Amino acid sequence: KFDVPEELTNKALEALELARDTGKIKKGTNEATKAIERGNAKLVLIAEDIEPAEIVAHIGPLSEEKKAPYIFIKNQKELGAASGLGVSCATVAIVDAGKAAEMVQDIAQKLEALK
Amino acid sequence: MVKSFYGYVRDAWKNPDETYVNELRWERLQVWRKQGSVTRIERPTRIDRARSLGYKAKQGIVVVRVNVRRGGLGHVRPNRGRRTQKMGKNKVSGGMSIQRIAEVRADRRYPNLEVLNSYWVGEDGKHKWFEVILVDPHHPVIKSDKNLNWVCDPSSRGRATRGKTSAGRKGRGMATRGKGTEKTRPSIRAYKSRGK
RNA sequence: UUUACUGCAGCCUGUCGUUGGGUUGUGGUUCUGGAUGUACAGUGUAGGUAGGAGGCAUCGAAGCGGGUGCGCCAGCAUUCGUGGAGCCGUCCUUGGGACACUACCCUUCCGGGACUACGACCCUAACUCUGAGAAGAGGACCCCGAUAGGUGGGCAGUUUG
RNA sequence: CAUCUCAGUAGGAGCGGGAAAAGAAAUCAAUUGAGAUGCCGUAAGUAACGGCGAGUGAAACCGGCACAGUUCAAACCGAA
Ligand SMILES: [Mg+2]
Ligand SMILES: [Mg+2]
Ligand SMILES: [Mg+2]
Ligand SMILES: [Mg+2]
Ligand SMILES: [Mg+2]
Ligand SMILES: [Mg+2]
């Protein structure tokens, strides 16, 4: 996969902030995994600086098996911040786009193309 | 199914040479060989194993990776009289398992803590690696915790050195009940060490 | 003390693990284009044993070139062409098998593609040595763990009525 | 005398309290039962092992002492 350009990742973060304002987000790897498995995950954001890599190694193939768009954020600090959280977050899932449904689907199409 | 991500970690470590854990193993063993005997780490390598063994993300709980050599009890040939049954020592491995050796070295490095449990995390032709979970019985966070404040009792000090961890009880023959445990429970020493 | 008995170290060597990636050489793994199968003569190549008889065809069936599968420069397959009727057998070419275009798994056929045990070579990326390091030299060897056989008065348990 | 015995004894190292360890069955049974652990009695010098030599050597059932049950990991929730 080509490195997703910074504008697309920033749009993903903006969509995450917007869904935090209005919609519903599952922050945390357990909640995001449950949301992907249940098929409720509109968009999955995955941090790239995870130690160990076992924490979020399954998210990609799982979301590709369940047809959930996903993107890799640079690191977990601002990923946790975008979800309004005082800690880091290895992955968040947007289960309710709220006011970002249009931008979430735009990001989904862009990810589908860039693949 | 709706399985937790701990289940995915468990699956990845079930057959590690057939999953992505093999490449992580190739990259990690270099770093681990560079390290010493007892290394503290921020997070467990296998989070599901640590959590099922009692690890919690709270203050007073420490996880450490220990390095232990392979093979049996490195033994010296006696230089005095023996009866040919006690002369040979090359094939005599010990009665102390490698995991319990790792637990006791971790305990030695951390005099104020108590070993909770440990799990296998890797090995090569010369070393095995275990991650040992240790608890601080004198931390107020641990004292408040009602699932862990048993470790603040006087009989819980020196757990790993008295064979009271899961690996130690496995080494004492008390991993099972019934037949075969005639000379193991309640202790090895209670039957003149004839069990094990 | 030793070519006494019985062992144990050390050492030699096989195997497994450490331990990876490429190149070829060795076995079948797995299967496409052909059912390639034929003492005697054949109108005809048992079109595998067969509902012991019964389908196609100028909208295709041959006697020909090195004869594309093959083979006794015959003949089944319609093919690059041009020549202007191959049957099935109750006249069974008095059968090692005697024969309908009817899902061929089967002694062939060599794209043998794909994983595989042994062996040879190369690579570096693990690993080893040197250096404070850049790096240099080795290198999946060696070391090491385990196991198998050997050698072994080095040692040590005795026996030597 | 070599396996065996002496004996997991002697001795060693580590840990550690007023006790320690064990402890709530992936148990023991047997045709159908019991129901955490420890300790005592018995089974019994029996079963078992053994140059089947010398020797070594249980457990369950059963009778007592004392009795006690529970906490996590996960599923669901998601900082409550
Ligand atoms: Mg040390
Ligand atoms: Mg106790
Ligand atoms: Mg001598
Ligand atoms: Mg003697
Ligand atoms: Mg216990
Ligand atoms: Mg004895």
Side-chain angles (χ1 to χ4, degrees):
Chain A
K1 177 181 68 65
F2 288 169
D3 53 329
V4 292
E6 304 296 356
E7 70 277 15
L8 193 50
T9 76
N10 295 322
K11 174 184 296 298
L13 268 299
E14 291 175 341
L16 173 56
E17 307 274 11
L18 191 51
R20 176 179 61 90
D21 268 325
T22 49
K24 284 295 314 309
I25 70 165
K26 299 300 185 180
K27 37 201 180 183
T29 305
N30 215 33
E31 304 191 50
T33 307
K34 308 293 182 54
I36 299 178
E37 288 168 328
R38 300 161 179 169
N40 305 133
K42 267 55 188 173
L43 175 63
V44 172
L45 278 57
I46 307 166
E48 291 170 347
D49 60 338
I50 312 311
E51 305 308 333
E54 282 92 344
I55 300 295
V56 301
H58 71 289
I59 297 295
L62 174 65
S63 178
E64 192 52 281
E65 156 197 359
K66 312 294 180 179
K67 301 301 178 60
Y70 66 97
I71 192 175
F72 288 105
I73 314 297
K74 187 62 64 69
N75 58 5
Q76 45 179 320
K77 274 303 299 295
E78 86 288 14
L79 183 48
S83 48
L85 201 63
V87 286
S88 304
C89 192
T91 182
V92 304
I94 305 183
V95 297
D96 185 18
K99 301 212 311 297
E102 68 288 4
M103 75 183 314
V104 173
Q105 59 90 12
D106 189 77
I107 302 169
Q109 169 56 12
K110 291 187 170 182
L111 282 168
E112 182 71 352
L114 55 86
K115 189 74 62 177
Chain B
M1 294 64 64
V2 182
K3 170 182 60 171
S4 56
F5 88 99
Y6 307 114
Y8 290 91
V9 194
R10 188 187 315 163
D11 293 13
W13 274 84
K14 268 175 180 172
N15 204 349
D17 47 330
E18 301 306 328
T19 65
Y20 66 93
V21 169
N22 205 27
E23 303 85 338
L24 289 182
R25 185 266 187 188
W26 183 86
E27 280 149 343
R28 278 167 179 165
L29 291 203
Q30 319 178 37
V31 171
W32 294 2
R33 297 181 189 104
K34 288 306 190 58
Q35 295 166 329
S37 181
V38 170
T39 301
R40 181 173 179 182
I41 59 190
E42 288 170 342
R43 300 294 173 198
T45 300
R46 311 168 56 195
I47 183 59
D48 67 311
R49 196 78 194 100
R51 296 193 58 82
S52 70
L53 289 172
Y55 173 84
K56 281 308 198 74
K58 58 174 55 180
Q59 297 161 331
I61 290 183
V62 166
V63 56
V64 167
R65 183 168 52 254
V66 183
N67 174 41
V68 183
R69 89 295 176 272
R70 300 203 62 171
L73 193 70
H75 204 279
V76 181
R77 182 185 188 268
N79 60 343
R80 285 273 186 163
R82 303 292 187 276
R83 61 185 185 90
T84 63
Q85 172 73 35
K86 304 303 197 163
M87 193 79 270
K89 300 297 177 185
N90 274 20
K91 273 156 160 283
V92 172
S93 56
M96 190 68 150
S97 65
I98 284 171
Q99 185 175 1
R100 221 201 310 177
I101 298 172
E103 287 177 335
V104 173
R105 284 181 191 178
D107 192 7
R108 194 82 55 177
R109 178 59 54 80
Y110 295 84
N112 60 316
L113 309 181
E114 287 296 326
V115 177
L116 183 51
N117 267 321
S118 59
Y119 55 88
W120 180 94
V121 75
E123 72 190 10
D124 77 328
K126 288 185 182 56
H127 301 114
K128 287 185 177 187
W129 282 273
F130 299 86
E131 288 186 1
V132 191
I133 309 167
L134 284 81
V135 185
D136 187 7
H138 303 95
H139 200 282
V141 173
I142 298 303
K143 292 175 176 175
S144 74
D145 188 13
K146 64 101 172 184
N147 301 337
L148 268 174
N149 62 344
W150 57 265
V151 66
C152 310
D153 303 336
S155 65
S156 300
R157 51 191 73 151
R159 286 182 81 247
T161 42
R162 314 197 325 274
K164 292 196 65 180
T165 59
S166 184
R169 294 201 318 280
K170 284 186 181 186
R172 297 157 75 196
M174 291 176 228
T176 70
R177 307 192 182 202
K179 294 168 168 298
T181 65
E182 286 89 9
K183 302 166 181 49
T184 59
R185 181 175 283 95
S187 80
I188 291 296
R189 179 181 157 93
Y191 298 93
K192 300 181 294 182
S193 308
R194 288 189 300 138
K196 155 173 201 296

